[PDB]
């Protein structure tokens, strides 16, 4: 999946 | 009383590697422990922590009987190649999850095959805040993520869920009680990185090497194993051996 190769990851709190 | 995971390599006395489980048979001495190694003398926790403060030392662990098949996270340079090898050569042993996205479904796409499509960005944000995802990220202003439930489905049907995720996901899976095999493949040198990736220059390989050293530091408490080797084939053997060894029904988990 092309889009998944291109993610800016978001931090999961906590 | 007392098994620990070593979080560093020790070359003395009992040699061990980052990730090894040690049975500590005597901890009476403040400076030195006697230890067995569940496949000699080792520095006590306080001694090693003094050396490093001048911090990853030991993590207490215990046996667990589990009732699911463990997810697998491979990290380090070579992870993409090894993940590809595993899922392609062993399709009956590994499964992958279907991720969620808020991007619109396109004409030839199938919900539940390409993605689980989420109609509202705000709803996916709520789900992320409610810990329904082990990892999430943004691309072209849409959200994407791998859900706890998608991993649980694979684990429960009896396959190892091969996950292309970052180190922060390991913690999320431990909280969910879906303990992953988390193997870091550690490069020996910039030379070695070039040897096994004749594509890169010695600037690209150096950056890759640097990034790996930092990753091992950042996530060193969360690995269940560390593998090294002089060839891809040696590495791949060691990864399969580690997956097998850490598969249980009986497994080691944090205490």
TrEMBL record, chain A:
Spell out the subcellular localization from the entry.
Cell membrane; Cytoplasm
Family named by the database record = Belongs to the GPSM family.
Q: What is this protein called?
A: Partner of Inscuteable
Q: Which organism is the protein's source?
A: Drosophila melanogaster (Fruit fly)
Q: Give the lineage.
A: Eukaryota, Metazoa, Ecdysozoa, Arthropoda, Hexapoda
